[PDB]
Write a protein that holds these residues in place. Structure first.
Motif, short mmCIF file in Angstrom:
data_model
loop_
_atom_site.label_atom_id
_atom_site.label_comp_id
_atom_site.label_asym_id
_atom_site.label_seq_id
_atom_site.Cartn_x
_atom_site.Cartn_y
_atom_site.Cartn_z
N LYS A 291 -29.58 63.13 -60.00
CA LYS A 291 -29.83 61.78 -59.43
C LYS A 291 -28.77 60.89 -60.03
N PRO A 292 -27.55 60.95 -59.49
CA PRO A 292 -26.50 60.07 -60.00
C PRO A 292 -26.76 58.64 -59.64
N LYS A 293 -26.54 57.72 -60.58
CA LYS A 293 -26.90 56.30 -60.36
C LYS A 293 -25.76 55.56 -59.65
N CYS B 227 -23.63 68.11 -64.92
CA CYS B 227 -22.96 68.52 -66.17
C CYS B 227 -23.50 67.66 -67.34
N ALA B 228 -23.57 66.34 -67.13
CA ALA B 228 -24.19 65.42 -68.06
C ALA B 228 -25.67 65.80 -68.41
N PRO C 116 -19.25 57.22 -68.16
CA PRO C 116 -19.64 56.33 -69.28
C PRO C 116 -21.08 56.47 -69.82
N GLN C 117 -22.03 56.96 -69.01
CA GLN C 117 -23.43 57.16 -69.48
C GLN C 117 -23.48 58.19 -70.66
N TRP D 102 -18.60 61.82 -74.21
CA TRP D 102 -17.45 61.79 -73.28
C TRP D 102 -16.70 60.41 -73.28
N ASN D 103 -17.34 59.34 -73.81
CA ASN D 103 -16.86 57.94 -73.81
C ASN D 103 -16.85 57.45 -72.36
#
Ligand SMILES: Nc1ncnc2c1ncn2[C@H]1C[C@H](O)[C@@H](COP(=O)(O)OP(=O)(O)OP(=O)(O)O)O1
Ligand SMILES: Nc1ncnc2c1ncn2[C@H]1C[C@H](O)[C@@H](COP(=O)(O)OP(=O)(O)OP(=O)(O)O)O1
Ligand SMILES: Nc1ncnc2c1ncn2[C@H]1C[C@H](O)[C@@H](COP(=O)(O)OP(=O)(O)OP(=O)(O)O)O1
Ligand SMILES: Nc1ncnc2c1ncn2[C@H]1C[C@H](O)[C@@H](COP(=O)(O)OP(=O)(O)OP(=O)(O)O)O1
Ligand SMILES: [Mg+2]
Ligand SMILES: [Mg+2]
Ligand SMILES: [Mg+2]
Ligand SMILES: [Mg+2]
Ligand SMILES: [Mg+2]
Ligand SMILES: [Mg+2]
Ligand SMILES: [Mg+2]
Ligand SMILES: [Mg+2]
Lengths: 480, 480, 480, 479
Positions: free
Chosen positions: D364-366, D453-454, D473-474, D478-479
């Motif tokens: 569920k990508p924001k 992946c996150a 960025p979340q 990974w920054n």
């Protein structure tokens, strides 16, 4: 004392018997590291940095490959470990006699400097081989590995220079085939050629068309006139014609390159001018000259490409003139190429006529207006004999063949049994002319004399004749 | 924008997106299932390469040469448009080839459709038109500045020559040189040769003597008879004779290999026996045969090497005879080679004599004890025309050259201005005879018929003549 | 104008006439007499190549890279001027090498002239200035639109880096990418490496799997930190780790070969023993030694591998000791290899501790009956620093990449984004020990001292430890 | 006696007439119609080479190694019989491969017949027995001094391993002969050597490994009361290099992202065709593509030809299979989204492969998405990269000798060689593809993938920041 391994870019990993290592690890052999294979060709093909040393290792290896392969396929030939080692040593040692810049030295310098003596790299190799053996205690080491020095040294020398009726003493006629491996006086099909084809091509950036491994697989010993000889497979005959075609191609593109040759000639000139001054110590402390070092092997041992740099870097004002020519080579202020032609008809130019040729060019009377007038001394005329290794003969007439239906019956094959597209002649001459004066006006004039001289003598029309000498080539109806 | 492809011959090749669109169609991708060397793969196991990769290389090299000319001579006004049209022609000049390449256009179609006058050239043009119309390529050409009416004509003319005094409509006389790149009808020096030399050698395990990159560096456009043509540098002429020597050499070693040809012949026999029964679906679902697939390009698109395996794997008893021949190929029970000969003198054997030849071998009367009698159906006679691409002519007579002193002035060079070691003829014929009956006693008879026939017709002596027929070769005085 | 050269690595390379003028000087031609691999030729007989041909290759490849960037990105405004200065820097960054290449800056100069710090980089700059001033190159530069004052600074900065925050005066920051071509101080990915990989491997008989032509195809310029830099394509990151793996592999198999190094060491010893007596003439007739020729470029010009043969061929008893060492190289009586070890854990071995190490190996007390006792000066201890070109650092952390979706956007890639199979460290030290005493008993002793010394210092167990020293290696628990 | 064949990799090879008899059979000649690299030809156009020529090379190199050992160490008493059996094993260890080589036993058979365990090695044994029985080879073996009872067993054991000292074909004093063709101890065998050289030649990537050097240095020594092949100590670096190169070739060529997707598309077509194609076997029985492995007469006829039987067909029952093959010709391929790897010791098991496309469609990508994708639109490919012995270092299983005592076998450990070597010998790569190819779907696919992946703590994709600037960025690392 077991097998050393060397990595060679042409052949891969080569195994050397320790007798071979002992021969290799001498000043006499290691000298070959400092003699360029292609001489002045390095100054035209920058990949051609290779020296005689690595070429010699490859010839030794390949000699061994061929003798081993014949022995495995035909044990009835009774090839011994002794034979194998003797053929490999001859393979290793048949380049020992080469001088500074290889063919420059035996081909240009020694003929002009010592026209009285009859000198070849082959005799040199023999003499240098004798010196190598005596100076380094090799006879006891030969004995150690079951060689008999009296017989076997004779065998090795005969392989290099030929006979010193069955003319040889080193082996009987049942081993006749062994004399065909290293230096083949019957037809020139030998392992020396095979290594230089592959090695020179690797370095020059020109690709090798000939497959010597295929040839070795198809090779057999058969009886021909009560001698056992190496025979090729019948259908491999086209590959042999191709072998000689490739040798001629390599001479045309590389080994007789017009600038490479002129570089060799300039170096020869510098060595002639330095010959009075450079002193080389040989045996008993006797002093020798670049021209006389061939008369003592201790001196010849120290005669290598290093001579070029000794001259270049000298400060002695006695060497100024030699030094200046070498300096012209560094700045690329070279003698200039005028052109190339050939004789027509039966006409062959003789070795005694060569010296008179610059005079004939300066004597021509071109009908063109000339600023400068050039004399004999301003022209170099270089006469190059191109052939298939047997003067006017077809070397494939001297090859024996076998067919698969009767593998021990030798046969002959004639040129018309192969192709109508082969050469109808097997020798010719090339004539190159150069001018020692390099300015635009000297060069213009030199071209007019040249083209006129070709016309006077009924030589072939230079390829660019109509461009370099538009006023001259219309006199000649034989050329349109 | 550009795709990059890695080719073992050429390295990383860049392709314009229009070329990608042409390449990604069923018509082009078809070339992946057509072996370059046909039955040669059954003799040289490295020769697995297909027409597809050769086509990519021809397209790439066409681009190299056209770019090189433009960079060096901006005055020629070579546009991106020209460049892309030359690459398209290079890519698509192999579209017309059929199953096993020269097997199909050289053996099968001549025997199955003797009344049509078919070439791979004509097929490429037809298949190119079908490719363009089936895949919406005309709008994509427009996208990148081509003009389909002019440019499609130009592309087709490059492939097959004029479609009908300046005979071409695609480009004017001031672009004459563009027609010498892909398929050179003047002298046969084109980029198609250059790719197959390099690629065939890589795969065959024979090495290429010819350097095309050197050629491209020295190529220039000059005026010849009111046409701007590609000219080679004068002293590159030797490399050009060598180019044709290499083409002939490859035909002798690989492309006309005696067993490779007989395998091609056996496959052709199987395809003839199958031609009634195999169906190939073309436009609107209509069905075609192997022999008629050339009449509809949707059907031809599906005519590939797969035909060989469709027959080998069939269970239909109507294909039993075709399938049995392919099975004999897998077991290596092939028709057996008897020998090779050539004609003497002015005698040239014509295409309409071919059928009568097995008849003439059967009718020889060899006087020996023969345990069998064979008849004409038991003999294959293969007649091979070997030349320098121009029948009896010397193609170097049709090359224009320039000299270093005046690079805009075209000249000609004759055979005698180059070397006396070159061929005196430029065409010849080889005759190979095979026997369909393979037993000990049939072959012995077959050899006797053959050698007697050679003697009867004054053909050359077979190389192994004296071993295969000891009793037949003394009766002929012209053989010593 | 445009000269063509045939190189076995690169094919036919075109040289602009300004480059020809730079090449045809004594300063450049000198490189023909300096072996690329120094004493490696004494182990790998194909490694006869000299720095000259490597230089041509670096110049050619510099031009390839700068041209490809200009064709793909016209917006960078790369001028004909820029191309020429990059090629010139590429040609001339080997001018400063001395006899036997890395032997001279790496062993000889440190031992002979310990106070001064000298590099081949500094040497190239000094020799380049000498080349330009001595041979009238500044006017010839102007003739082809270079601006001598700016462009000479640019060339020198490319070779040695900044001369004295944007540190370069030869070009602005909008052309920073030009500094990463010839000699890349950021990450070491440059065309110098690319030539020597391909060339060294050709000659050594070792094949290298790095594809530089692929890298050049994928290369792009992007913004990173207000600077234009060269960026690689993201998915090419694996090939870059492979590039450095191959460099390390080549150092392991060839460039740090245990015998090649010892031959380099013996030559260094010979040169030190000769340094007082050999004289090189420099500017205005002043005399220099081998060690001080670096202070005058007229002298340095004449300092080449020829020094080896002046020493070998000398008869002066002042050179007896130097000459005898070179004689031992000819007879293959080399200092003998004892073994190899490495430190454990944190342990670095310092620049200062090198001289102490031979003393330490003679100090170890092996509990074994020994027929002789060795002293310190009988041992040579060689410390080799093996890394990825930036000491402990990962050079791929200093590479910028681009992605297919946004080719203008530079990114970074970390080791964990690539693979877990990569090296965890990027630097290490190897320790080799040699014995100057070569008979059976001294060698047997040397092996006891060495293996005991390794145990004493908690270094890794030599691979042959258990065979060469069976009584010693049970005293160490950790070796089992 | 001997036929000569010219091979571009090895030159002129000599073949004994028994090997010619084995070669000139339908079962062997079949290998001419099976591409070595399968779908790699569709990416590397030089890779046209087939299993046939590879087999010839393996047979040749097996002979080289066994002969070199016999010459250098006569005391081993290697016979003409042994040499011939080693060469036959070499020639025949690729007989069992199927259409497109690793596509068939790596993807098709696992998906079509999950209940069974089939390897190419098993097929080689079965196809070898079939070749021998069908073509009268036993009398010809006897003619040349082989004894079929022992020797057929020996050959099969060389190919598949054994069917205390586990082998019946030869005793422990010829142990070393089992290390030539297929080396189950460490994977250093002649099969590798041929494919390194041959694949590189065709692919246009250059071979780093020198097999001839290895052969010249190899010796037989006593190790734990077997006679084994040993390498020379200082050549251990070249052996680490050998496996590095195998890994390099897998990364650049054999696991090329598009080559694998083309293999996957061909597998899909073969599945869709599996009900409808007949392959005729022994007796006249009909088998399927998936069942041809159960009858060797049927398997003999199963080759790359199947691909074109499908592509050229007009049967409407083959439409779905045929359309997939058509999309390969037009280059309308499933599209690559990206690559990642696991982390720590997440190790993704074969039991979890089916679950992965479902996991990606569930992320569920924001971010605002114009289209939505589901499981069926995703392919997830898991590749196990290693040095041939899962987690282990194969060089720990190699025996060496030193120059000072050539008959004395020793061991060498990783720290005795270099600190710059890999400190882990296995890893997994995860590649994700989308079946829907338009601009909006690809944009969506990349958001799902990066988010996935996150969510799973996989590595940050190399392109993560460009393809999904709003998602990277979340994540904390990974920054
Ligand atoms: N890894 C390698 N790959 C290819 N060639 C190599 C390699 N290592 C060395 N060579 C070359 C250099 C020589 O020409 C040849 C033999 O070298 P090498 O085996 O190192 O012998 P050596 O005499 O130094 O060792 P030893 O005496 O310990 O057996 O192989
Ligand atoms: N590392 C490599 N070395 C040499 N050749 C390669 C390598 N990787 C791929 N190739 C070959 C296969 C193809 O012929 C050609 C292009 O491959 P590649 O660059 O992977 O394109 P691609 O189309 O898969 O990537 P993209 O579309 O992401 O740019 O080079
Ligand atoms: N036939 C050939 N094939 C390959 N390389 C060649 C051949 N001829 C010469 N070379 C090499 C040698 C040089 O390195 C390079 C240029 O040589 P070449 O064209 O002979 O120049 P050149 O300077 O003698 O001629 P010119 O000045 O007359 O143009 O090519
Ligand atoms: N001139 C050649 N150069 C390189 N390879 C060749 C040449 N001629 C043939 N080959 C290849 C093709 C085959 O792979 C192999 C053997 O071919 P060749 O000797 O023609 O065998 P053949 O079986 O047709 O002859 P025969 O049975 O008459 O002995 O070598
Ligand atoms: Mg040694
Ligand atoms: Mg000779
Ligand atoms: Mg792509
Ligand atoms: Mg043609
Ligand atoms: Mg010139
Ligand atoms: Mg550097
Ligand atoms: Mg045959
Ligand atoms: Mg295996």
């Amino acid at each position: 004392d077991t097998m050393k391994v060397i990595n060679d870019p042409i052949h891969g990993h080569i195994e050397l018997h320790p007798l071979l290592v002992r021969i290799i690890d001498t000043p006499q052999f290691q000298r070959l590291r400092y003699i360029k294979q292609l001489g002045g060709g390095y100054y035209v093909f920058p990949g051609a940095s290779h020296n005689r040393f690595e070429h010699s290792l490859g010839v030794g290896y390949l000699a061994g490959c061929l003798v081993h392969a014949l022995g495995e396929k035909q044990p009835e030939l009774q090839i011994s470990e002794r034979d194998v080692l003797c053929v490999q040593i001859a393979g290793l040692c048949r380049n020992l006699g080469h001088g500074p810049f290889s063919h420059m030295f035996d081909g240009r310098f020694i003929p002009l400097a010592r026209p009285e003596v009859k000198w070849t790299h082959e005799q040199g190799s023999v003499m240098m081989f004798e010196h190598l053996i005596n100076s380094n205690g090799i006879k006891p080491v030969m004995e150690q590995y079951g060689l008999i020095p009296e017989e076997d040294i004779c065998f090795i020398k005969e392989q290099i220079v030929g006979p010193l009726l069955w003319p040889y003493k080193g082996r009987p006629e049942n081993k006749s085939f062994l004399y065909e491996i290293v230096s083949n006086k019957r037809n020139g099909i030998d392992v020396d050629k095979w290594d230089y084809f592959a090695r020179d091509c690797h370095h020059l950036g020109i690709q090798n068309n000939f497959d010597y491994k295929r040839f070795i697989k198809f090779a057999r010993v058969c009886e021909v006139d009560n001698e056992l000889r190496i025979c090729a497979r019948d259908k491999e005959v086209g590959n042999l014609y191709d072998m000689f075609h490739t040798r001629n191609s390599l001479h045309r593109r590389a080994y007789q390159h017009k600038v490479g040759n002129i570089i060799d000639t300039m170096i020869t000139d510098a060595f002639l001018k330095a010959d009075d001054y450079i002193e080389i110590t040989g045996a008993g402390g006797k002093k020798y000259r670049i021209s006389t070092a061939i008369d003592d092997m201790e001196a010849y041992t120290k005669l290598t490409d290093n001579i070029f740099l000794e001259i270049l870097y000298s400060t002695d004002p006695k060497l100024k003139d030699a030094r200046e020519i070498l300096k012209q080579i560094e700045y690329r202020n070279l003698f200039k190429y005028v052109g190339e032609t050939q004789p027509t008809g039966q006409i062959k130019i003789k070795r005694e006529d060569y010296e008179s040729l610059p005079k004939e060019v300066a004597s021509a009377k071109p009908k063109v207006l000339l600023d400068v007038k050039l004399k004999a001394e301003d022209f170099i005329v270089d006469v190059i004999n191109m052939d298939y290794g047997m003067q006017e003969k077809n070397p494939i007439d001297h090859v024996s063949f076998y067919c698969k239906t009767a593998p021990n019956r030798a046969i002959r094959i004639t040129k018309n049994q192969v192709s109508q597209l082969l050469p109808e002649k097997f020798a010719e001459q090339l004539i190159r002319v150069y001018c020692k004066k390099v300015d635009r006006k000297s060069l213009y004039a030199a071209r007019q004399y040249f083209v006129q001289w070709c016309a006077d003598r009924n030589f072939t029309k230079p390829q660019d004749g109509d461009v370099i000498a538009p006023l001259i080539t219309p006199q000649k109806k034989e050329w349109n």
